């Protein structure tokens, strides 16, 4: 688990980008009230 690359600004629209290294995926931790892969949708 580590910081997302700087390349990823705006992948996680309303959330925070997380770089799961060993597992080789990026994850958006969504702000409360936002869902989606990129935290794109509300409620």
């Amino acid at each position, epitope marked *: 688990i580590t910081k997302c690359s*700087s390349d990823m600004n705006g992948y996680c629209l309303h959330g925070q980008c997380i770089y799961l*290294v*060993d*597992m*080789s*995926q990026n994850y958006c931790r969504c702000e409360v009230g936002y869902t989606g*892969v990129r935290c*794109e949708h509300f409620f």
Partner: antibody, heavy 118, light 105 residues
Framework: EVQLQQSGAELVKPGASVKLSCTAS????????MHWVKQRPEQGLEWIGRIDPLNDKTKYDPKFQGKATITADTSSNSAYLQLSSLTSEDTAVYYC???????????WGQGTLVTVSA | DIQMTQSPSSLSASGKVTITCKASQDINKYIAWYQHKPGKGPRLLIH???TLHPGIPSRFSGSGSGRDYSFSISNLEPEDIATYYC????????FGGGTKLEIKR
């Protein structure tokens, strides 16, 4: 399961223009940056650029600005590379790939050959 | 924007080869190393400098920090004769020039 499938080979008069397509199975391109990558024969890998199909914004490697235009159609789950004023320099295989969820390229299309020749 | 130089362009050993890669800016460990072959897409081996990618043999061994990086195969049994690309992704994307391997005889 991830599939990227690109359109067929192209043969283009020099000076002309072509528009390649990449269509994605197994995921929504709204949730991902779609990238295009050039490989000119016997030569390595050139990163062409990317689009965000969600907001249609784009970035390009400055070597390609003016030459490439990357678009997306969320409707058909497709991204497109369009190359203007073709020269023999543009004669290459073009690969699409995805980013966002993938920190780096992992899945690719089968590649599309563009042969610029009269 | 941000340049990548991968030495050497080709080499031969029969062995233990390692490839270098240095970058215009330092890229905070966001490099990856690809292995390319005829008609195939470039398969990813190593991401984040060192972290092996789920389902890859443990002889591949990237390394480094800052502007300067390494990639090493243990021994090219036999599949691993091919071309190798370093890729930064700290800010946009840039491929290294590549490294083609031959079998020294």
């Amino acid at each position: 399961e991830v599939q990227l499938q690109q359109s067929g080979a192209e043969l283009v008069k020099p000076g002309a223009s072509v528009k390649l397509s990449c269509t994605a199975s197994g995921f929504n391109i709204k949730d991902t940056y779609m990238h295009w990558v050039k490989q000119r024969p016997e030569q390595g890998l050139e990163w062409i650029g990317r689009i965000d199909p969600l907001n249609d914004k784009t970035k390009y490697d400055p070597k390609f600005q003016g030459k490439a235009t990357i678009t997306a159609d969320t409707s058909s789950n497709s991204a497109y590379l369009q190359l203007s004023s073709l020269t023999s320099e543009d004669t290459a295989v073009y690969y699409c790939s995805r980013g966002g969820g993938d920190p780096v390229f992992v899945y690719w299309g089968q590649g599309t050959l563009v042969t610029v020749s009269a | 924007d941000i340049q990548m130089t991968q030495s050497p362009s080709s080499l031969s050993a029969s062995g233990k080869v390692t490839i270098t890669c240095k970058a215009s800016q330092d890229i905070n460990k966001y490099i990856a190393w690809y292995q390319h072959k005829p008609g195939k897409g470039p398969r990813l081996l190593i991401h984040y400098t060192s972290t092996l990618h789920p389902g890859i043999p443990s002889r591949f061994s990237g390394s480094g920090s800052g502007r300067d990086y390494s990639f090493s195969i243990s021994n090219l049994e036999p599949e691993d004769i091919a071309t190798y690309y370093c890729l930064q992704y700290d800010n946009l994307r840039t491929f290294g020039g590549g490294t083609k391997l031959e079998i020294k005889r």
